Symmetry: D2
Subunit: 390 residues, 4 copies
Amino acid sequence: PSIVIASAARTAVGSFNGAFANTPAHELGATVISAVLERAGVAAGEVNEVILGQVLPAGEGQNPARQAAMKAGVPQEATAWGMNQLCGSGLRAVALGMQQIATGDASIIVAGGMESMSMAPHCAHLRGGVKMGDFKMIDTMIKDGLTDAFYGYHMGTTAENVAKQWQLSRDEQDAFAVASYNKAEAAQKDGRFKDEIVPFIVKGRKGDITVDADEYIRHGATLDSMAKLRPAFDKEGTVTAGNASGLNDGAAAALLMSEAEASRRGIQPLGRIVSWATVGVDPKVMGTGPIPASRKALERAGWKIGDLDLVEANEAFAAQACAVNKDLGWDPSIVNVNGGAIAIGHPIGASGARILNTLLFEMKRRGARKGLATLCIGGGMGVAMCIESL
Amino acid sequence: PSIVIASAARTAVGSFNGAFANTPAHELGATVISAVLERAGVAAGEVNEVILGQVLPAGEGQNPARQAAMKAGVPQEATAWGMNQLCGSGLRAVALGMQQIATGDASIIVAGGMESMSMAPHCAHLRGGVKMGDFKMIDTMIKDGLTDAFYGYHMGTTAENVAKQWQLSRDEQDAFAVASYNKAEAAQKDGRFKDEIVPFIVKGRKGDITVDADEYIRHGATLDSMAKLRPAFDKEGTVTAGNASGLNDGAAAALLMSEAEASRRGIQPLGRIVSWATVGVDPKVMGTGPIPASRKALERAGWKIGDLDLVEANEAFAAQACAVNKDLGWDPSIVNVNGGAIAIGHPIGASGARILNTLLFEMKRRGARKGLATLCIGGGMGVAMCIESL
Amino acid sequence: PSIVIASAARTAVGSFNGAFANTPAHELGATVISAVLERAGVAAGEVNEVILGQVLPAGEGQNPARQAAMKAGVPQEATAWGMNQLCGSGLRAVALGMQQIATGDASIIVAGGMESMSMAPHCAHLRGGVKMGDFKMIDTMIKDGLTDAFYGYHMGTTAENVAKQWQLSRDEQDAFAVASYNKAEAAQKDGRFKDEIVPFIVKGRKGDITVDADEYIRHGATLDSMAKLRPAFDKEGTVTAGNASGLNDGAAAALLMSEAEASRRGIQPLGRIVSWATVGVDPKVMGTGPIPASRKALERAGWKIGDLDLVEANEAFAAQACAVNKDLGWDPSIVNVNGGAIAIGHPIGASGARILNTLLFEMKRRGARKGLATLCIGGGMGVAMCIESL
Amino acid sequence: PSIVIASAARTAVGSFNGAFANTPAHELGATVISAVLERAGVAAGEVNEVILGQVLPAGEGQNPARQAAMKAGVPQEATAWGMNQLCGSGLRAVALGMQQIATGDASIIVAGGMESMSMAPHCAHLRGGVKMGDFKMIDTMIKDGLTDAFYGYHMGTTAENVAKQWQLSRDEQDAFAVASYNKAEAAQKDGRFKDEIVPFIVKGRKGDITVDADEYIRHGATLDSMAKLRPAFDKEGTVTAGNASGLNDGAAAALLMSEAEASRRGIQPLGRIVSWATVGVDPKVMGTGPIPASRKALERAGWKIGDLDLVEANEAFAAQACAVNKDLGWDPSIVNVNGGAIAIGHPIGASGARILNTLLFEMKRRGARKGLATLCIGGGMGVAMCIESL
Ligand SMILES: CC(C)(COP(=O)(O)OP(=O)(O)OC[C@H]1O[C@@H](n2cnc3c(N)ncnc32)[C@H](O)[C@@H]1OP(=O)(O)O)[C@@H](O)C(=O)NCCC(=O)NCCS
Ligand SMILES: CC(C)(COP(=O)(O)OP(=O)(O)OC[C@H]1O[C@@H](n2cnc3c(N)ncnc32)[C@H](O)[C@@H]1OP(=O)(O)O)[C@@H](O)C(=O)NCCC(=O)NCCS
Ligand SMILES: CC(C)(COP(=O)(O)OP(=O)(O)OC[C@H]1O[C@@H](n2cnc3c(N)ncnc32)[C@H](O)[C@@H]1OP(=O)(O)O)[C@@H](O)C(=O)NCCC(=O)NCCS
Ligand SMILES: CC(C)(COP(=O)(O)OP(=O)(O)OC[C@H]1O[C@@H](n2cnc3c(N)ncnc32)[C@H](O)[C@@H]1OP(=O)(O)O)[C@@H](O)C(=O)NCCC(=O)NCCS
Ligand SMILES: [Cl-]
Ligand SMILES: [Cl-]
Ligand SMILES: [Cl-]
Ligand SMILES: [Cl-]
Ligand SMILES: [Cl-]
Ligand SMILES: [Cl-]
Ligand SMILES: [Cl-]
Ligand SMILES: [Cl-]
Ligand SMILES: [Cl-]
Ligand SMILES: [Cl-]
Ligand SMILES: [Rb+]
Ligand SMILES: [Rb+]
Ligand SMILES: [Rb+]
Ligand SMILES: [Rb+]
C-alpha cells in the first residue's frame, strides 16, 4: 500500500577507463547492495529480490544482477533480474521494486542500477561467416547505448535538435555547464557526497586502492577553455564535450520496504515513493523526455510544480537540460543543487538510481518535504518519480 | 483489479542458424506485437507499454523492445523496455506487465519475450589494448546465456547434477525425449500449433519466404539412433543433444488488460492470471527451479496440484524435466500435451511466453479451466504462473 | 651452366571455400614437393633449397616454405624460404631457384608457389587499444592480394583502365572468356591435365577425399548467360565475374637442376630455362605488364615472336589478356590451348608455377620446341620466362 | 663477376610500441632506400630492382617492398618484391640481389630488410564461420615470427635447448648480455652509429619528431639487476628478458652494383661480397645456425677462421651466442664490437641487413680487411656472408 525507501547508497562515479577500468558492473553493484543493507540494519538473508538496471551487460556472464546479489551475501532462495530502459533504468528499477511490494509479491527489495561503460566489449556477428571483405567490430557502448536505432546518429545529435528547436545558443549551454561544474565541485569540497557514497575497494595485484570520491568532477572549470572546444557531434553544431555529460562507471541502489515494515524495525526512511510515471516522445528530441513524465508523476501525486522543494533532473546534455527547466518553469535554484551529470558523470544503467541517491540525501540534509527525480531516455522516453519525506 | 490475457501469439521456433539465421530479434517481436493486436481487435495506438524479455541483445541497437514496438506500429507516446531473467524472461515479462495494470499505472500491455540466438555476436574487451599475445573472442550466447557465472560450466552440467542427485538413468532421459518428439510431431501433423503461430515473412533479396511451422521438430525420431549419441557436456555423463533442448530463435507475446476493459470491447480472453511466483534455488541444481516456484504459485492461487487440468513445464533438459514431474507428482499425461522444449526448441528470452502460448491455446481447444506454466532459470531460479479460463 | 626442369607437378586448383577450404598452403606445397621428387627419382636428402612464392602467409606459422619442405620429407640440413611478388611469385621463384644453380651455390632446387586464399584471415592492429568507436577487421586477401597499394581500388578496376585504353567492348571481353572456358572444359574431358595434376588427400574426420580434378572449370559456358552478369567493379563498367579470374587455392612447383646432372640420372627434362625477365609498368594499367616483360625475355633468349610454338599467358582479366595478345601479335591458337586463369583458377602465389606446368606438359605432348610463360603482376609489374624443349 | 656494396644505411632501432609504434614497415624502408641512393650519388631512375626481406607483412597492403621503392622515388619501370627467411631475411636479400647482378639480369639492386613488429595485427580465419563457441585472435608477431611451426613452443624454448646442450649457466648468459650492453652504450656515446643511421622523420599531427638514436639501448646496465629477472619461457629455465633479444622496429639496406660499375662512377665501396652460404640445422637447436653456415661461407671464400678481422654475429639469445663463439672459437673481442641484438634490438625482417650495416661501417672505421656477418634462423637454418674491404 505505502512503499518507503529505507536506505540508499551509490559508488563513486568513475571516469571512462579510469578507476573502475577493469571492474565488472556486478562488483560495483555488490558493494552497493551490502551498503543499503548495512545502512538500514537489514541482513542479506531478508532480501526477497534484487532488481538492477543495466544497459551494457555483454561479456559479464549469466544475469549480472544475480551475480551482484550472490556476491553481496543475498541467499540463493532469493531472485534477481535486470531490465533495460536505457538511461532511466536505474530509476525504473526502483519503480519496479516498488510495485513488487505493493502487489504483495515481495516484502524487501534492493533495487537500483549498475553500469561499467569501460568494460563494454566490441562485438561482431560471425556465425554465418564472412566469405570475403572487411567487417566492423561494433562498440556495444556506442551501438546498444548511445546510438539511436531509428535515425542512426548519436544521442548528442538529439541534443542538437533540442538546441535548434528551443534556440539555445552555444554560450547559453556553456553557461549551464559551468554552473553545473561549480555546484558539484562545491558539494565535493563541503562533503555533501560523503553520506551517499560508499567506498569501493578496487582489488588489485600490487596493492588495493580505495575509491570514495567522484573522479569526474573537474576543479576550476573556466569558461574560456569551455568555449574553445569543438563540437563533438555536428560539425557546425553546439554540443561539445564540456556542455555534455560523459561516459562513466558506477552503481547505485536503494532498499525498498513498506511503511509498516519499516516501523517494525525502527528504521527512519529516507522518503516515501508517492508516484512515478514514464512517457514516450519523439526519438529525435529524446531530451524532452522529462517534460511530460514529470507532469504525469506530479498529477498522479496530486502535487503542483510549485509544491516541489527539491528537483534532480539528469543533465545528459546542457541543450536538453535547459528546455526541461524552461517548459516546466520550476525555480532553477532548487534543481540539481549539488550538480548534474555534466560534472558528476553519467553511467547509463545507474544514473536513474544515482540522482535518486543525491536527491534523497539532500532532502534529508536540508529538511525538504517534497522531491522529484527525472531523466531523459534514448529512443524517445522519460521517467519521473516523486518522493515525500516522513 | 483482475488482469486477463486478451490475446497471445508466437512465431515459429526456428533452428539454430536456420530460417531466422539473419533475422534480428526485434523484427520477430514486431510480428508478434502486431499479431496480438490483430487477434484481439485492439489498435496499436492503444498500447501503453511493451515489455519484452530478451537475454542476448548485444549488437541489436538501443533497447530492442522499443524497436519492436515502433516497428509494430506502437506510437512514440507509449513506452517499451526489456528485462533479463534468463530462460524465464518471457514469462516474467507477462507477470511484470500484469503488475503494471494492477497498480493502476497502465491499461493495455503487450508483454512477452524475444530471442535470436543465431544473431548473438562474439565479443571482446579491447579498450585497454592487447600489448602482446593472443586473446579470446567470447561467444555472448555461451557466456551470457548458457554458462553458469558461479561454477563456470554449461547448463548441461547442472542437468548432470540433477541426473545423479535424482538417479535418472540414460535410458530414462532418452525415453522422455522420444516421448516429447512424438508428441510434438503429432501436434504438428494435426495442426495443434496453427492457432498460436503467426507466420513470419523472411525478407530476402531473391524472393521472400514465409515461416509458419516449427522447423526444429524432427519427424520419425527413433530411440535406436537416440542411444548412439555421445554426451555433449560430461565425457562420462548422460545428457546428450537428443535428450536436451536446442539453441533456437523465436518470439512470443500476449496482450494484457483488465477483465472489465476486455468486457468493454467484447473480447473473449484466453485466460485470467490468478497467481504467479518466482523462487531461487542452488545454481548447481537450477533444474529444480520449477519445483518450489510452482508450489508458491499454487499456494497464492488457493489451488492444489490436483486442481490443475493442464500443465506446460519447460523441458530444458530431460534430466531436469523428470525430477520436476517426480517431486511435484502431478499426472505426466497433462504435462506438455503437445511436446516440450526438447522437440520444439528453446529460445531463452522468449521461452517463458512460448509455453504460455502453447498452454493458452491448448486450454481453449479442450475446455481446460486451471493451468500452470513454469520454467527453470539459470543461476538457480524458477518462475511459475497460474492461468484460469473464463 | 645450363639449368633444366627435371620434373614438375601441381595440385588441382580448388575453388574459393571449396575442396581446399580448410587446407593450409604448406600442406598443398608439401604434396607438390613430394611429387616433383618422386616424378624425377630424386631423394629428399639431395634437395639444397626450397623456394615457394606465397602472398598470404598470415596465421600459418613460421615460414610456410620451411613447413612444406619438412612435411614433404626434406631433411633439416636443407634450407627453405618464401618470396612475394604477388601474381608472378610462382614463376619468379623458378627463376630465383635457377640462379642458385647458375651461380654455383646449389645443385638441386625445388621452386614454385603455393597459395590458400580460403585460409586467408581477417586482421586488425590492436596493440594500441581501441578507446572508443568501431574498427574494421581487414581481409588480408583483399588488402594484401587484390587491392593496389597506390590507388586503393581493386585489380578489376585496373582491368577497366586497360579496357578503356585498348577499346575492348563488353562483347569482345566476353567472347575471349567463352573461348577460354571451352578450351579448359575440353582439356579436362580429354585428360590433358592428368599428367600435371598430383592428387591431394584432404585429411578429414569422417572420411578422406582425393582431389585430382580442377573443380573451378565450369561445364557448358554459354555466351547468352555471359552477357547477363552485372559488372563486379565499376557500376557502368565492363569487367564481370565471368570474363575475370577467380579466387582459388592451389600449389605448383618444379625440380631444377643442371643439364649435366639430369643426364647422369637418366632424367628426361621437361624443358630448359633459356631466359627470363621482369619489368615494371604503371600500376593503373598493371595488365600491360606481360607486354614489355615478354619482349625482354625473348630478347634475352634471341627469339622472335614468330619462333614461339606454344604460349601460356595468364588470363587475370579478359580486358588485359586481349591487349597482350593484340600487342605481341602472336597466334591466339597457340596461346593457352588448355585454357587460362579465367576458367582454371588463379591462386596468386602459385599461378606462376601453375601456368608453367601447363606449358611444360603441353610442349611435351605435341612436340613443341620453344615456349614462353608470362603473367601480369599487381602494382604494375610483369614476369616472363622462355622454355626450350630438349 | 664481382659485386660490391656501393652504399648502405639503416634506421634507428625503435622499441616495441615506441617511436615507430605507428610507422608502417615500408615507410622505414623508403627512408633507407632514399638514403643509400643519396649516399652513393646514384639516382633513383637507375635502380633495376628492390629486394626487401620482411617477415610480418600482414595488413600493410600489396607487396610492401613495392610500396617502399615507389615512395622512395624509384620509378615504376623497376620491379620490387619481398622474401621471408625469418631472421636471415635481411641478409639473404643482399645475397639474392648479388646473384641478380652476377647472372647479368640486373645492374643496380637495392637489397635489404624492413620490419615493424609494433604494427603486427591480430588475425583469425573467419570465412568458414564460427557456428558456436569461442575462438582465439592470433597474434601474427608471435605466430608467424616467434612460434616454432614444428613443436609449438616459443623461440626462447629453442634457446633453452641450446642452453642445456652446451651447459651455459644463468650467470654465464647474464655476463654475456652485460658485455653487450656496455659495448653498445659506449658505441652510442662515442657516435659510432651516426654514420650508419639515417634520421627518420615521424610524421605526426601535433608536431614532427626526428628519430636518429637507437632507443632500445639501455643506459647503465647493472649485473645486480640482471640476476633478478624471472625466466620468460621455461618456468624453471634460465633465459630471461635481459639475456634475450627484444621486439623492435627498424629497416636497413644496401646498394649493390658490380665493382666495375662503382669504378665508372667514382664510388668508394663499403666492401666486396666475396662469398655467402646458408645451411639448415635442427629446429630444436636453431641457435646453432651460424656455426655450419659460417664454415661453408669461409670455405667458399678460401678463408680461415683466423683470417676474419671483424665479425657481426646476431645475438638472438645469450644461450645461442655463446655456443657459436665457443664452437667456432673466434676471438670474442672482434665479435660484435658495438654490441648485438640483445642491446640494440632485433627487427626480424631487418636484422640481417642491420648487422650488415654495423659490420660495413666498423670495417671502414678501423681499417678492417676481412669481415663476416651471420645470423641464426628459426625453424633450423642459418645464413652467413663474408665481406672484404677494397
Ligand atoms: C561527448 C563525448 C563524445 C566525449 O568523448 P571524449 O572526447 O572522450 O570526452 P573527453 O573529455 O575525454 O575529451 C574531451 C576533451 O575536451 C577537454 N574538456 C572536456 N571537458 C572540458 C571542460 N569542461 N572544460 C575544458 N575542457 C574540457 C578535455 O581536456 C578532453 O581532452 P582533450 O582537450 O585533450 O581532447 C562523450 O563523453 C559523450 O558522448 N558524452 C555524453 C554521453 C551521451 O552521449 N549519452 C549519455 C546517455 S544519453
Ligand atoms: C546440446 C547442444 C550443445 C547441442 O549442440 P549441437 O551440436 O548444435 O546440437 P545438434 O543437434 O545441431 O548436433 C548434435 C548431433 O546430435 C544429433 N542429434 C540431435 N538430436 C538428435 C535426435 N533427437 N535423434 C538423433 N540424432 C540427434 C544431430 O544430428 C548431430 O549429429 P550430426 O553431427 O550428424 O549433425 C545445444 O543444443 C544445447 O546446449 N542445447 C541446450 C540449450 C540450453 O542450454 N538452454 C538453457 C537450458 S536452462
Ligand atoms: C570478381 C570476384 C570479386 C567475384 O566475386 P564473386 O561474386 O564471389 O564471384 P562468384 O564466384 O560468386 O560468381 C558470382 C556470380 O557470377 C556467376 N558467374 C561467374 N562466372 C560465370 C560464367 N563464366 N558464366 C556464367 N555465370 C558466371 C556465378 O554463377 C555467380 O552467380 P550466383 O551468385 O547466382 O552463383 C572475384 O572472382 C575476383 O576478385 N576475381 C579477380 C581475382 C583477382 O583479382 N586476381 C588478381 C588479379 S592480377
Ligand atoms: C622476453 C619476452 C617473452 C618478454 O619480454 P617483455 O617482458 O614482454 O618486455 P620487457 O622485459 O621490457 O617487460 C618489461 C619488464 O622487464 C624489465 N626489464 C626489461 N628489460 C630489462 C633489462 N634489460 N634488465 C632488467 N630488467 C628489464 C622492465 O623493468 C619491466 O619490469 P616489469 O616486469 O615489472 O614490468 C619477449 O620480449 C620475447 O620473447 N623476446 C624475444 C623475442 C625473440 O626471441 N626474438 C628473436 C627471434 S629468434
Ligand atoms: Cl542473513
Ligand atoms: Cl498478484
Ligand atoms: Cl578516491
Ligand atoms: Cl506490509
Ligand atoms: Cl477488472
Ligand atoms: Cl487468435
Ligand atoms: Cl493506432
Ligand atoms: Cl549482434
Ligand atoms: Cl571480454
Ligand atoms: Cl536449492
Ligand atoms: Rb563534461
Ligand atoms: Rb534436441
Ligand atoms: Rb570466372
Ligand atoms: Rb633485452
